[PDB]
């Protein structure tokens, strides 16, 4: 009875993005503690990625809160385990994160393009306010990270950028 | 000479939104002082609804300011007296407020699709920023109030929800 | 059961002073946003008349609270739109205001004359305490405002009084 | 040689009201301690009525002070013991106080109407300033209380209103 | 243009009350500096009566401010010289001020009766608010002083009551 | 490798908008120091336009930061010198600025239209969030200034508005 | 009638320098945002050159202020777009700024030598006070930077100097 201008296809897209943000959260947590293994031992990457895990779990909860505000119903799925068990050099993990965030961006845009076709002006603006520029700034951050990490090279530079920059 | 991309039909629609926001305001004032009558005596509801009345008046001034900013012209109408002189129990009045808020939301969504068809980016963003999400938030709040007022039940519970939740 | 020494003619009297007060709130809010128009651009009168709109809206609620205190029943009517869509010069606006407040004042005294003619000591003293002198002091204020606005003249003077004295 | 415009009849009516304000005081102190009885044990009503009894003693001292200000002589009578020795439910006692304060308001308006017929402008205003509006608000407060006492009902609702609202 | 419900006779009354208030002021100033004289030399009464002069001139200015407010025209007259050049003992001086406030009080009550007959309810409340109760309190204070000046008697007692009570 | 859903015409439009806010920033610099001339010497207009010149500079910079954030390339052109070398009366300059801002507002709305047509949801919300409402507020502000500057006229009115309002 | 000892030729040379200080400003702002590009991502150089560009804009405003102080008229020219659209390595951009500031120092000494030949003692001193020593220190700072950029080398040394020393 609060539901208004809230399409069922939009409702299911919210449900798939919820799962999607949880999966991003689970993947970053895996990166965080891959950097906590003694054989890797990059503490700033671990701090940085652990908070990336917290933020994406906050994205999933925004989507959940929004599903309820609009009169939708929350339907949770399995959160697939991450696609790798270890994540390589630092630059490899950051490159993995960029690819993850671009796929997350693309789904948000698909979700956006979808509420638009259902005439859902509020849902469109809600997604712009909370996700579309944040995703854009997140992807620029990572692009910068990858360029700098190429600059300072393997070895002493990877340590330096992990300490003086990530966290 | 300050008018720029402001359609004659968009302006007329702001003028009717001004009236509707003033109608909401006057209805909530009726609700506020109904709950201050000795045969009802619910000080939470009165506080709560007096605030609501104040806010619907602020929305009406926003729109007037918005008309003036975009080069339009405020044209005022009578403010129709509210559909009821008394509003029953606490839950009933809450339900009337949900009914009115959904009606105000549909007028806003209509006004949004209108400016969109005249291709008025600034106006659609304006409605989104100041209104469309506040309507969703308020419609969710009213939904929760009707649900809890059902859980608390008549008698002691109506008083408790009124005292400890509303104002 | 709380009603005592409260004639049904007076209960009707308060109800219609309520409407009259709300009408003045709306007249003034029209004035305040007429002065917000680019073609007019008098920020001081905008502030001043906006304030005056809230103060008569508070007047209306005193009466509503009173009606309730004595054991009456509020019955709201429509709030008729203002006499005028636009308000001329600043002096023109202030002079219509003085007219409004003398009409209002007159009906307060016709409402007083009749709580008196029914032996309602407390109504008369409540009207005196909250209304008769506040009206007097306002009408004097507005008369001073008309005399000064004549004094400083159109154009630069109108500006200066608006800026330096109204808000 | 301080007496001026002070009717002999107004003076005796002040003396009877003095007795009536004390009568109220003693009735309230019998309520306040009935609710301190273990068979009743409502500490919130006890607090509440004890205060009321101080209030009504204070009123009595206002009238005595006034009789001295206007050149009259205070003549004291027995303070009749209250009408009951126990006062039933909390709602029973509140309705009973509404009746007392109803009688007192009638006695005060009749006093007002007496001094008005004797041309005593200062007396009329004094009664208006110290008593008549605060009797109206007292009757408003007690009516409201009764309505909320009927709403919360007997048992858990009586306890709650005792503890939360009275005292 | 501001004048409303303000009779020509009352306006003449406000003018005579103004002259009386100024006359009052000028008699207390005389008393004040009579006590400043070496042959009298009562400094507490000099302080006291000087404040009574300052306060009676404030009364004169309120009435003028009331005249301007109601749309009257202030018409001023000679301020007659007080009735005595010297005022005997401290008790005599108070007895003359008791005589003087009672004349003022009678004139204030004549003034009330007379706006009342013209149905000027604001003017009746105004005289009640600012003057009527104040006259009563001052006559009681003056009578109180007079009884005490009898009790302390002549000599050392007049000295003591001047220093320790007046100022 | 960060570029995503960013069209290549949009990227061109961001560069020409960059050139357009620098052209404005430079026009406002010209105006600011024209009023600093002894033959003109309006210090308030100096401050005011100097600050507008900084704000349009920052507009240019936000647009370059967005080009970078979105994965495009900044290409700059000559900053065309302002269209006049002197700016007439104060009211003339504020008219030139309204023209200038309405032209900016047109290209921003052409850039919004244009990204919309490519489906660039984030760019649209970016222009609404930083530019479209800011434009509308500046235009209203400017039109009010012209209306007031008209009212106060030339001579003392121009000096006064310069000093008390602009800067 | 303020102009004194101010040669026509000195005046035009001030105007050309104004253009040259702005030219520097726009060249630096193109550096500052090239280093904000993801392919470069040197936030320390971005901070650094953005500041330099504000500095050089400020210089421009000094010259405009001076041309007004000495009775001349400011004549604005196009601001030519910088020489490159991207600026290579961090050391490449610093050497390039050293060359710019070298040209500017030459243009400023030639301006100095011009006013000296025209007997303009105040102008010579002004250029000495606001520009010539702070060009020398600017050339000193940039030389030092280049030497430390050649010392830390490309890769890890570039990152470090960016982060630690510039910004």
Author numbering:
A (entry chain H), B (entry chain E), C (entry chain F), D (entry chain D), E (entry chain A), F (entry chain C), ...: 3 to 169
From the paper:
Subsequently, Pro156 was replaced with His, termed P156HAfFer. To elucidate the detailed structure of the 3D protein arrays, the high-quality cubic crystals of P156HAfFer were obtained, and subsequently, its crystal structure was solved at a resolution of 2.50 Å. The space group is I23, with unit-cell parameters of a = b = c = 229.16 Å and α = β = γ, indicating that the SC lattice was yielded by P156HAfFer. As expected, the introduced histidine residues formed two pairs of π–π interactions between two neighboring P156HAfFer molecules. Additionally, two pairs of electrostatic attractions were formed by Lys93 and Asp94’ between adjacent ferritin molecules. Although such electrostatic attraction is also involved in the formation of the SC superlattices, the designed His-involved π–π interactions play a dominant role because wild-type AfFer cannot assemble into such SC superlattices. Although the adjacent P156HAfFer cages are not aligned along the C4 rotation axes perfectly, the dislocation angles and distances are almost negligible relative to the entire cage-like structure of ferritin, and thus, they do not affect the overall SC structure. Additionally, in their SC crystals, the C4 rotation axes of adjacent P156HAfFer cages are not aligned perfectly, while the P156FAfFer molecules are perfectly aligned.
